[PDB]
Amino acid sequence: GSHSMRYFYTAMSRPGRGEPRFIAVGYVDDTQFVRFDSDAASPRMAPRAPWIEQEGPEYWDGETRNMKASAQTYRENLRIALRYYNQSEAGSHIIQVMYGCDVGPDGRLLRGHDQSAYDGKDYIALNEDLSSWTAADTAAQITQRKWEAARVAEQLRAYLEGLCVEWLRRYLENGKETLQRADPPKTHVTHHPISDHEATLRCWALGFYPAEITLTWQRDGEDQTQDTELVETRPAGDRTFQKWAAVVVPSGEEQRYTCHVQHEGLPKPLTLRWEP
């Protein structure tokens, strides 16, 4: 199917406690494959998936050099942001960045991304054209002006259409046994009385990959969106994900409720019910 590669950077200042920490992680789809942490005893870009381990020392040395350079850039950006927002040197602040590419089954670019935040709010984003920027406020407009003058968007576009897609295709081939395998959810419905008058039906999905899934309850064939409790999809720790959806139902009406599961590992959506 379709696939993505994403890098996520977090830079966190901590006045009085040294220089800002810089952490980077890389993902293909929902699989982390690299990390870098400036607080490690010996900072290096390090593998986090088996299929990246075969990259040679030139790869790891180059990625480590790039992360060290990026840490320096984002430490400077934290100082610049203080000026742009008229902020004191006493507070802790955070820059976040996400960038990468999405490809289709043919491996061709579907779209690229490059967006940043300051203190958890949008700061600046590369538009889908990979040629212009959206600035969230008058501070980010200063950055936008600098990046327009230096034709930064052209450099992002070159990466996103070139090396980003090329490396993603390589990783997908090297990791094809996992990255190109969908694991369908294992599903069941549980029932727990809450009183003499009502019971909870909980529809479970376990063991699935990738994380995207839809779990819905219907009553008499109508979606129960506003009466369904839906937990956030959560990692199991073995690459797979878990989720549940619950509804409170009148006792004796349980068979009027059906749970519907959609996942890319299922050739057809599943319908299930409580099976006493």
Binding site: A69, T73, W147
Partner: peptide, 10 residues
């Protein structure tokens, strides 16, 4: 592989 973007600051 990560983006190598030298000499670009906010």
């Amino acid at each position: 592989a990560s983006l190598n973007l030298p000499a670009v600051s906010w």
